[PDB]
Amino acid sequence: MIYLSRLLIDTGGNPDRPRPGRKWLDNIYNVHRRLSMAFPSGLRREQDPHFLKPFSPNDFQKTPFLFRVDNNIDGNDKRAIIIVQSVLEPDWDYCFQNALDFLAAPPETKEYNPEFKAGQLLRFRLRVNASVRRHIPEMVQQDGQTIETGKILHKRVSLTWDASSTPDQALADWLAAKSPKLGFTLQRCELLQLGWVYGSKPEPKNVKVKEQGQGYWREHKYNPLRFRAALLEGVLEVDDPKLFLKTLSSGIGKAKSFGFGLLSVLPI
Amino acid sequence: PRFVIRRELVVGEDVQVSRETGTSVWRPKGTRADYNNSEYKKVRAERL
Q1: Buried b (16+ CB within 10 A) or exposed e, A102-113
Q2: Inter-chain CB proximity B46 and A218 less than 8 Å
Q3: Min CA distance, A208 vs chain B (Å)?
Q4: For residues A90 and A5, what is the distance between their CA atoms, to the nearest angstrom?
Q5: Which of A10, A74, A157, A263 is the least buried, fewest Cβ under 10 Å from its Cβ?
Q6: Interface probe, candidates B39, B42, B43, B46, chain A, greatest A C-beta count within 10 A
Q7: How far apart are the C-alpha atoms of A196 and A229, rounded to whole Å?
Q8: Do B46 and A208 touch (CB under 8 A)?
Q9: What is the rounded CA–CA span in Å between residue A137 and residue A144?
Q10: What are the backbone angles phi and psi of residue A251, rounded to the nearest 5°?
Q11: What is the 3-state secondary structure (H, E, C) of B23-43?
Q12: Cβ atoms A22, A11 nearer than 8 A
């Protein structure tokens, strides 16, 4: 089965007070990690039920989940919504048992068994990673004069349109170039919000050999993480059954570990 | 019975004065670890 969840964050009120939940959302590595401890090891939940031990990546089960973050829900209060889709049952009472100030409402979970027929009108919302891998020459220095070096870089850059086409048309072309393999066809697709996402990540680096030996002394060094994001909403029609279900809970684009593929489907 | 005389010796010219060669007071250990020492920053970084 498929499991969907919702988390609510205030993100508002008095700006003069500490707001740890508001601070948690500025980094996407932290958001992904915080969703990632929501699944302990059969042994871990018997070892520390209080979640008061050092966190290591190896004592938690591995599952390729997908998530998206949304905003602007009114009702005289501001809210931030995290929607998590996974193939195992999340344990929301273990991830946030010492972090209740993050959220303005207790978490909720429900089952999801979506069964469809071919040729069905469906409403979808998706934020896509607009990236293309390209060949780039190497520019260095730029100390008032550009120095060229013959190395050609294979790097992942954003998709680029020309000067005479709208971004929505090029994004729709990029999505309809891919929709035959996933199992769907477009009729309409408009661009809502396009932008960048920054993240920072700890990475260990060696410094000095221990005098007593057995390892190093080490120091954390932090590496940037830049991605392109474009949020899209539209109406699609199904072309294959086990193929649309092959599209769901697997992803459509790249960077899925950092919340870049999630299909939210409504039968219109 | 025996015969006894008395003599005197002024210090500083034919007998020297040795140093203390030790510690008298005991006192407890050192609290107040310094937070600008290099070993502290190295251990803090490794623990992080």
Answers
A1: bbbeebeeeeee
A2: yes
A3: 10
A4: 8
A5: A74
A6: B46
A7: 6
A8: no
A9: 19
A10: 110, 155
A11: CCCCCCCCCCCCCCCHHHHHH
A12: yes
HSE-up of residue B45 (Cα within 13 Å, Cβ side): 18
Structure tokens at A30: 């932290």
Q: Nearest CA to CA, how far is B39 from chain A (Å)? A: 11
Q: What is the rounded CA–CA span in Å between residue A105 and residue A71?
A: 15
CB contact under 8 Å between B46 and A217, yes or no, is yes
User: Residue A109 is encoded by which pair of tokens?
Assistant: 């979970």
Residues of A in contact with B42 (CB under 8 A): 207-208, 217
Partner-chain contact B45 A208, CB within 8 Å: no
Tokens of B39: 């070993």
Experimental method, per PDB record:
cryo-EM
What resolution (Å)? 3.1
Token pair 């004069």 in the structure block, residue: A145
